[PDB]
Amino acid sequence: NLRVEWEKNMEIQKKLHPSGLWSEEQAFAAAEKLGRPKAGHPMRVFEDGYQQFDLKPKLFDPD
Amino acid sequence: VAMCFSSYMLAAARQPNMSAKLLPYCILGFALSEALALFTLLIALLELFVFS
Amino acid sequence: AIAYEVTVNGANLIGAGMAASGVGVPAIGVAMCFSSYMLAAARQPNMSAKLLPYCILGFALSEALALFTLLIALLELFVFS
Amino acid sequence: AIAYEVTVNGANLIGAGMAASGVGVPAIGVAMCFSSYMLAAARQPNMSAKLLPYCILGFALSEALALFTLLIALLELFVFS
Amino acid sequence: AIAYEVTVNGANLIGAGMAASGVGVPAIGVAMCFSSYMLAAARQPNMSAKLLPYCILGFALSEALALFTLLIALLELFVFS
Amino acid sequence: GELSEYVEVNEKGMPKPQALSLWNMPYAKRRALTKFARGVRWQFIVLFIALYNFKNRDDSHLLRRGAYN
Amino acid sequence: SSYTGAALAPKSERLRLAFEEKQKDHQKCIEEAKGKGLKKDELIDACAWTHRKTILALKDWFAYRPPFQDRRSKWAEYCSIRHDSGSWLGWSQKFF
Amino acid sequence: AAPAEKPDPALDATKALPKALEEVEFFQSYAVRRKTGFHLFNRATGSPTIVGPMFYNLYNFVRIGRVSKYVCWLSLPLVFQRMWMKNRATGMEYDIDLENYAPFEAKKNPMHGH
Amino acid sequence: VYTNWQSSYTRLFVSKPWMWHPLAWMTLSVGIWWKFGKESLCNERSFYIHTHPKWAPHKFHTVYNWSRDPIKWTLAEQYASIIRNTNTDIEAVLKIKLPANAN
Amino acid sequence: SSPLVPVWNDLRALQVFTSQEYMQKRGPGFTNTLEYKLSCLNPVKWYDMMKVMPGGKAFVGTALGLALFGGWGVEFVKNISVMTKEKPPIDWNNEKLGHLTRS
Amino acid sequence: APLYPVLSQASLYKRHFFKNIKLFHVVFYVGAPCVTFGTAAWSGSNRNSREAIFMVIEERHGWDNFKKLSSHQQGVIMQEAAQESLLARNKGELHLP
Ligand SMILES: CCCCCCCCCCCCO[C@@H]1O[C@H](CO)[C@@H](O[C@H]2O[C@H](CO)[C@@H](O)[C@H](O)[C@H]2O)[C@H](O)[C@H]1O
Ligand SMILES: COCCOCCOCCOc1ccc(C(C)(C)CC(C)(C)C)cc1
Ligand SMILES: COCCOCCOCCOc1ccc(C(C)(C)CC(C)(C)C)cc1
Ligand SMILES: COCCOCCOCCOc1ccc(C(C)(C)CC(C)(C)C)cc1
């Protein structure tokens, strides 16, 4: 009860991410605090042989 | 399916000597009954893994 | 014309219940087999050995469709995002 | 074309009702086994001991499908946001 | 793409009826167990004592699935916001 | 029974009807029906489907090149 | 909206642009290794990946021969069918 | 075509269930126990339990085993290990910054892929 | 007394179709793998599909770590070893300008 | 299978026995007609009557029909779902790349 | 006057130990250590806990820093990671996908 009450109060005041979800603002703030690299998108869907069995692939588009 | 097989059971208990003559119908009742279950199941799995 | 693509994430977990409603409809047919085996043996105990194959044969098939009905709802969640 | 993702949080529960609605259909198959054992013993009391194992076996199997249906309803709520 | 999270508060209450619909299906099995035990007793009065244990067993235990069909709807409203 | 591509024969050498009798119509009508029939059913259906798709084939690759200008 | 239809560029142009993109992605790795001050063996360990990607694009380009024009291919164009104008037997020429 | 085969008694089914009941009777024969040292907690009604009176049979067979009765128990301390570590983890104090940066098996984490 | 059981495995194999069955099984399975699984899964051009969560769930006991990319660095080490064994120039590929199939 | 099997059997028997009735009606003299004299010089008839011969000639005829025409039939079946589809223009080879003086 | 290589009585006595085995004599005697120290109970728990532990470590602290620290603090951090994984606060305390 103590743990879940503290966790709920921190989820309410946004000092802690919600249960099961990665929050962007909190993750970026924690990275800036610890002086670590920021959470990027390291995946590569357009790598050779990742979506070959995918009937609905993803299209390359330079934004 | 179990309707067909229950019918086969009660027919055999009514008359054991007719156990073999109704066995072809015991198989024919299941094959083209389970097939309709498969056509429905075929749609539900065809509904996902081909449509984009 | 205009084109709005929408990705409804709720249908990931709606269809799970929609399939879950059907998982029990085979069970009433499953029990029909063993009820039949009971009453058939009550009519003729000596035949209970020859019908028991058809009893086991009658269960696993009738039970199977329930399992197939259960597959989609479990295929619906633990792979789709 | 434009792309709007939507995450419906309400869908965490709409399926749970359907999964709950399908838990009661096997109950008829559940009682169909005890009814069969009743009528079987009512036609042949001496065979009551040899059919009781089939009776317990059928109750569990019919009950399991209802129980399997229940897993979706309980799995749909306490983990999914 | 854009992401609109929505919280449908009405789905807190919609599902209550959806689960509620399945509460009366087990009643047919429950009454079936007695409809069996009556006819069995009319077939053999003397065996009425040995079937009564297996007459309340399925009685209360089919209602148990009805209880879990009902316990969700009552767990759906007075705790969820 | 009721096998595929199978037919019984009576003492007069005639085919016995399994489901339907069609030997009442005259020989001229039978020859009219069967002069163009074959022992092949699904290939004609596939051929008509192919002819429909050939009538409705695409010629965009020729439009880009200018065969219709 | 969207549509299921023909590829935009020809195969040859597609492979050419892919080879150019991998050339760029390899040149960037090489420039970064030079800015970092790496030797030959370290530059190899750095940019072997993009080198292999470029080599695979080059292999695809060399492997794809554009088709030759002849009466059979032109008739196949008119018929709007995928046709090999180098086979007397079709699917069995693979085994004959 | 008309072979006229007599019935073969070997193809009948009049021994499988008797043999299974013989095996089960051999099983239950080892459940016979004396009156001395007998105790069984009944239900609150006073009626017996289900699993209760069928523990003596299982442990009488464990008595006759040779290796499993000295090996299969070595996975049981691991249960208490989990019982203790779970209770340690239910209330473990953790860094908020590390929890927000590296949540374990959380959804929508781009470092995982989704 | 002569027996192929104890004196000739070849004649024993020839005289028993139920010994041919496992060999045909093996040949068919290997042919199936060669036709379908070889180029789609095992080739270097098609090896990143094992990182997919749908078609290869938890092939690495977890979701695939893309920040680390063990496949990339393993294969890069191997290509580097190939390049060092062949004494090939890295920058020779960048001096190429492919033409276009004009007209 | 379908329950129309006896219907199809009746129709097959109809056409077969009507063709035989026609042959009985026209009676002898077929060898004097022009149709027979052309079928004697027609390769389709040679192949069709060699198919039913013994000595593996059914296998020979079927495999020959495959090797000759069934490959084109497979290609045709593959192209049925290609005729209706949008395809790009053919990148005809400029026939300029490849020439190189000998040395 | 036996013309064959007669095998001694002690050699037969020893071979009988090897060929007089029964199926249960193999199954249970080799399955008990296997089931206990196998992928189910001990080795599985160890080797599958390690994956979550080192995932958590490489996410929170880093593998290089973890290798640089002492074995004691390494084990402490591993134990904390094990507790976080066993808890599974994000999965609703359930080890399912
Ligand atoms: C009993 C009397 C009945 C009266 C009714 C008769 C109606 C007959 C059907 C006519 C329909 C024609 O249908 C129309 O055909 C044309 C070609 O002809 C198809 O068009 C197709 O061929 C053209 C011509 O090269 C290609 O460029 C095009 O890419 C392709 O779509 C149309 O997609 C289809 O819509
Ligand atoms: C409800 O279950 C019914 C299924 O029926 C199974 C029928 O098969 C029974 C086989 O059981 C056995 C096992 C061992 C044996 C003996 C005693 C012969 C074993 C032996 C050779 C060790 C002495 C005999 C029967
Ligand atoms: C290989 O298959 C054989 C396995 O058979 C196992 C059967 O399991 C049931 C045995 O458990 C029991 C149940 C009841 C009882 C005793 C309690 C019969 C009732 C008693 C002793 C009070 C009369 C003993 C053991
Ligand atoms: C309901 O039954 C559950 C028990 O199942 C246990 C599974 O055990 C695996 C095989 O166990 C054996 C071992 C030996 C045997 C015998 C002794 C009959 C082997 C034999 C025939 C070689 C003597 C039978 C079964």
Short mmCIF file of N, CA and C in Angstrom, two decimals, chain A residues 5-62:
data_model
loop_
_atom_site.label_atom_id
_atom_site.label_comp_id
_atom_site.label_asym_id
_atom_site.label_seq_id
_atom_site.Cartn_x
_atom_site.Cartn_y
_atom_site.Cartn_z
N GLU A 5 0.88 3.76 -3.15
CA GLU A 5 0.45 5.13 -2.87
C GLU A 5 1.51 6.13 -3.30
N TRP A 6 2.77 5.87 -2.95
CA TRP A 6 3.86 6.74 -3.40
C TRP A 6 3.95 6.78 -4.92
N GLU A 7 3.86 5.62 -5.56
CA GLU A 7 3.95 5.56 -7.01
C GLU A 7 2.79 6.30 -7.66
N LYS A 8 1.60 6.19 -7.08
CA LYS A 8 0.44 6.90 -7.61
C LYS A 8 0.58 8.40 -7.44
N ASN A 9 1.07 8.85 -6.29
CA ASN A 9 1.27 10.28 -6.09
C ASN A 9 2.32 10.84 -7.04
N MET A 10 3.34 10.05 -7.36
CA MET A 10 4.35 10.52 -8.30
C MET A 10 3.85 10.47 -9.73
N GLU A 11 3.00 9.50 -10.05
CA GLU A 11 2.40 9.46 -11.38
C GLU A 11 1.45 10.63 -11.56
N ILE A 12 0.78 11.03 -10.49
CA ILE A 12 -0.14 12.16 -10.55
C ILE A 12 0.64 13.45 -10.78
N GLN A 13 1.68 13.70 -9.98
CA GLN A 13 2.46 14.92 -10.15
C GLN A 13 3.56 14.76 -11.21
N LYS A 14 3.48 13.72 -12.05
CA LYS A 14 4.29 13.60 -13.25
C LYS A 14 5.78 13.51 -12.97
N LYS A 15 6.16 13.18 -11.74
CA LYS A 15 7.56 12.92 -11.43
C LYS A 15 7.99 11.52 -11.83
N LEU A 16 7.04 10.64 -12.16
CA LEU A 16 7.33 9.26 -12.53
C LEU A 16 6.43 8.86 -13.68
N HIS A 17 6.96 8.04 -14.58
CA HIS A 17 6.21 7.62 -15.74
C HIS A 17 5.00 6.78 -15.31
N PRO A 18 3.94 6.75 -16.11
CA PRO A 18 2.79 5.90 -15.75
C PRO A 18 3.13 4.43 -15.94
N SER A 19 2.25 3.59 -15.38
CA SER A 19 2.50 2.16 -15.35
C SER A 19 2.41 1.56 -16.74
N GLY A 20 3.53 1.03 -17.23
CA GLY A 20 3.56 0.35 -18.51
C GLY A 20 3.91 1.22 -19.70
N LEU A 21 4.02 2.53 -19.52
CA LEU A 21 4.26 3.47 -20.61
C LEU A 21 5.57 4.22 -20.40
N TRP A 22 6.33 4.35 -21.47
CA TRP A 22 7.53 5.18 -21.49
C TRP A 22 7.13 6.61 -21.83
N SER A 23 7.36 7.53 -20.89
CA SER A 23 7.03 8.93 -21.10
C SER A 23 8.23 9.70 -21.62
N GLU A 24 7.96 10.59 -22.58
CA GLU A 24 9.03 11.29 -23.28
C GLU A 24 9.65 12.37 -22.40
N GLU A 25 8.82 13.22 -21.80
CA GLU A 25 9.34 14.33 -21.01
C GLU A 25 10.15 13.82 -19.83
N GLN A 26 9.61 12.85 -19.10
CA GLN A 26 10.32 12.30 -17.95
C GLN A 26 11.60 11.58 -18.38
N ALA A 27 11.56 10.85 -19.51
CA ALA A 27 12.76 10.15 -19.94
C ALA A 27 13.85 11.12 -20.37
N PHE A 28 13.48 12.17 -21.12
CA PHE A 28 14.44 13.18 -21.53
C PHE A 28 15.01 13.92 -20.33
N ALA A 29 14.16 14.25 -19.35
CA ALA A 29 14.64 14.93 -18.15
C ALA A 29 15.59 14.05 -17.35
N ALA A 30 15.29 12.76 -17.22
CA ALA A 30 16.18 11.87 -16.50
C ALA A 30 17.51 11.70 -17.24
N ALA A 31 17.47 11.69 -18.57
CA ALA A 31 18.71 11.60 -19.33
C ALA A 31 19.54 12.87 -19.17
N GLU A 32 18.90 14.03 -19.21
CA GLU A 32 19.61 15.28 -18.98
C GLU A 32 20.18 15.36 -17.57
N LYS A 33 19.48 14.78 -16.59
CA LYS A 33 19.96 14.80 -15.21
C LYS A 33 21.18 13.89 -15.05
N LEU A 34 21.07 12.64 -15.48
CA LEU A 34 22.18 11.70 -15.37
C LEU A 34 23.29 11.97 -16.37
N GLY A 35 23.10 12.92 -17.30
CA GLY A 35 24.14 13.21 -18.27
C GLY A 35 24.38 12.10 -19.26
N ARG A 36 23.34 11.34 -19.59
CA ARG A 36 23.42 10.21 -20.50
C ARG A 36 22.91 10.60 -21.88
N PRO A 37 23.16 9.77 -22.89
CA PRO A 37 22.56 10.04 -24.20
C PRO A 37 21.04 9.95 -24.15
N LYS A 38 20.40 10.72 -25.02
CA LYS A 38 18.94 10.75 -25.07
C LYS A 38 18.40 9.53 -25.80
N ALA A 39 17.19 9.14 -25.42
CA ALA A 39 16.54 7.97 -26.01
C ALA A 39 16.17 8.27 -27.46
N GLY A 40 16.92 7.69 -28.39
CA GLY A 40 16.66 7.84 -29.81
C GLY A 40 15.81 6.70 -30.36
N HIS A 41 15.73 6.66 -31.69
CA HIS A 41 15.04 5.61 -32.42
C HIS A 41 16.07 4.77 -33.17
N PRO A 42 16.77 3.86 -32.50
CA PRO A 42 17.88 3.15 -33.16
C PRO A 42 17.45 2.11 -34.17
N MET A 43 16.16 1.81 -34.29
CA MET A 43 15.74 0.76 -35.20
C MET A 43 15.90 1.21 -36.65
N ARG A 44 16.00 0.21 -37.53
CA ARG A 44 16.20 0.43 -38.97
C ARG A 44 15.26 -0.52 -39.69
N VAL A 45 14.06 -0.03 -39.99
CA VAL A 45 13.07 -0.85 -40.69
C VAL A 45 13.45 -1.05 -42.15
N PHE A 46 14.18 -0.09 -42.73
CA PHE A 46 14.60 -0.17 -44.12
C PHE A 46 15.89 -0.96 -44.31
N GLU A 47 16.37 -1.62 -43.26
CA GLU A 47 17.53 -2.50 -43.40
C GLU A 47 17.18 -3.69 -44.29
N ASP A 48 18.20 -4.22 -44.96
CA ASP A 48 18.01 -5.32 -45.90
C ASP A 48 17.47 -6.56 -45.20
N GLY A 49 16.23 -6.92 -45.51
CA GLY A 49 15.64 -8.13 -44.97
C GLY A 49 15.10 -8.00 -43.56
N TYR A 50 14.16 -7.09 -43.38
CA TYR A 50 13.43 -6.89 -42.13
C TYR A 50 11.92 -6.97 -42.32
N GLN A 51 11.42 -6.48 -43.45
CA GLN A 51 10.00 -6.44 -43.79
C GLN A 51 9.76 -7.13 -45.12
N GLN A 52 10.45 -8.25 -45.36
CA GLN A 52 10.28 -8.98 -46.61
C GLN A 52 9.00 -9.82 -46.61
N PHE A 53 8.64 -10.42 -45.48
CA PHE A 53 7.35 -11.10 -45.39
C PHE A 53 6.21 -10.15 -45.08
N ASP A 54 6.47 -8.85 -44.93
CA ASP A 54 5.41 -7.89 -44.66
C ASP A 54 4.71 -7.51 -45.95
N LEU A 55 3.43 -7.85 -46.05
CA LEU A 55 2.63 -7.47 -47.21
C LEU A 55 2.44 -5.96 -47.28
N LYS A 56 2.36 -5.30 -46.13
CA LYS A 56 2.20 -3.85 -46.06
C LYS A 56 3.49 -3.22 -45.55
N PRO A 57 4.51 -3.08 -46.41
CA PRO A 57 5.79 -2.52 -45.95
C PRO A 57 5.69 -1.04 -45.63
N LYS A 58 6.80 -0.46 -45.18
CA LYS A 58 6.89 0.97 -44.89
C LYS A 58 7.73 1.63 -45.98
N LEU A 59 7.26 2.78 -46.46
CA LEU A 59 7.87 3.46 -47.59
C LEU A 59 8.89 4.49 -47.14
N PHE A 60 10.04 4.51 -47.82
CA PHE A 60 11.06 5.51 -47.56
C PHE A 60 10.61 6.86 -48.10
N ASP A 61 10.76 7.90 -47.29
CA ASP A 61 10.36 9.25 -47.67
C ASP A 61 11.24 10.27 -46.97
N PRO A 62 12.09 11.04 -47.69
CA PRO A 62 12.89 12.07 -47.00
C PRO A 62 12.04 13.25 -46.56
#
